[PDB]
Design a protein around this ligand. Sequence first.
Ligand SMILES: Cc1cc2nc3c(=O)[nH]c(=O)nc-3n(C[C@H](O)[C@H](O)[C@H](O)COP(=O)(O)OP(=O)(O)OC[C@H]3O[C@@H](n4cnc5c(N)ncnc54)[C@H](O)[C@@H]3O)c2cc1C
Ligand SMILES: NC(=O)c1ccc[n+]([C@@H]2O[C@H](COP(=O)([O-])OP(=O)(O)OC[C@H]3O[C@@H](n4cnc5c(N)ncnc54)[C@H](OP(=O)(O)O)[C@@H]3O)[C@@H](O)[C@H]2O)c1
Length: 295
Amino acid sequence: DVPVNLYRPNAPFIGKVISNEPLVKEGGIGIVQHIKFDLTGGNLKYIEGQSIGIIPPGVDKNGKPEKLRLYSIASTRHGDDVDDKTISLCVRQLEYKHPESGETVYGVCSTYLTHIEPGSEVKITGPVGKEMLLPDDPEANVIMLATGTGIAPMRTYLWRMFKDAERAANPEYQFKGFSWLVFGVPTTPNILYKEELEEIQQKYPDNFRLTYAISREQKNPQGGRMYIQDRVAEHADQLWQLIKNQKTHTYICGLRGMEEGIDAALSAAAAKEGVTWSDYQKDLKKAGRWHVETW
Ligand SMILES: Cc1cc2nc3c(=O)[nH]c(=O)nc-3n(C[C@H](O)[C@H](O)[C@H](O)COP(=O)(O)OP(=O)(O)OC[C@H]3O[C@@H](n4cnc5c(N)ncnc54)[C@H](O)[C@@H]3O)c2cc1C
Ligand SMILES: NC(=O)c1ccc[n+]([C@@H]2O[C@H](COP(=O)([O-])OP(=O)(O)OC[C@H]3O[C@@H](n4cnc5c(N)ncnc54)[C@H](OP(=O)(O)O)[C@@H]3O)[C@@H](O)[C@H]2O)c1
């Protein structure tokens, strides 16, 4: 019964930004912001795993209106306020060099948001998606593989799982299963939510496992940069075993560049046990326990 598109892209909800706290601490790379909007009075309800769209002002080169962009929701259904009045996004300002002219180029909607001023009205659409929904089963297991801003939904799971206030507010959902987040980022200053993430590993040690793949501070066995799939291979067998359990849901959010690695590792660990991942997986997917959201 997931609520979808309570706001079409042609009648966006206009909400005021509440805060735009920065997530990349000194020294890290780029900019990644934690923007919280205020939905009060709009009836825009959503559930962990979904994502909303933001429509920047302006028009493109071709003179047409700037089409919306998606963004995984980073807050739970209650918002960081635990009052059902807000919603928050985890947004990295896009910034690259022109394939030919060297000129630095920033992204449109991403710079718009990363620099959005608290108190500014922002066009919001959605929520959409039913592929990253967290199972209601408190006894389920959650393996989470994400990179960069891909942590956004993982935050919405983890929070709804271990953040006290949430526990208090969600009597029906008192997590007891096992969760494991393999988080891929460039540097330590870039470990988005490092504070809370590592905090939850305190409160609930036997229920949350945080593995980091800090790409530019860690080298993998082959000499290369430590990426998610490397970690996923380091604890391959374990993961595989934890994946065979029928109460285990896996969630992947980030660059499809990982899918290849993750499949490679898991498929191998699945061979030692005479099993064909490519097919077993096809099932997890059909079963609805292989949630993948890449961009
Ligand atoms: C389901 C989904 C979830 C998402 N979740 C998040 C999230 O939580 N956080 C987040 O930031 N984004 C997320 N995004 C991405 C979001 O849609 C936008 O792509 C992003 O925020 C950039 O917006 P922009 O307007 O700055 O992009 P634009 O400025 O419009 O840039 C996009 C264009 O830039 C060009 N381009 C990009 N890089 C280069 C380069 N290296 N060299 C040459 N050309 C280049 C390409 O032509 C591309 O079409 C998500 C996307 C989807 C599909
Ligand atoms: N995070 C994402 O899932 C994602 C999604 C789409 C686009 N991007 C691009 O990167 C920016 C990401 O910013 P962000 O905060 O989302 O993420 P981020 O902070 O850049 O984190 C991305 C992480 O992904 C790692 N990575 C790079 N190539 C990979 C690959 N081949 N396979 C697996 N992991 C890989 C990176 O390693 P190195 O950087 O050290 O190579 C880095 O540690 C975007 O603006 C866009 O340019 C990222």
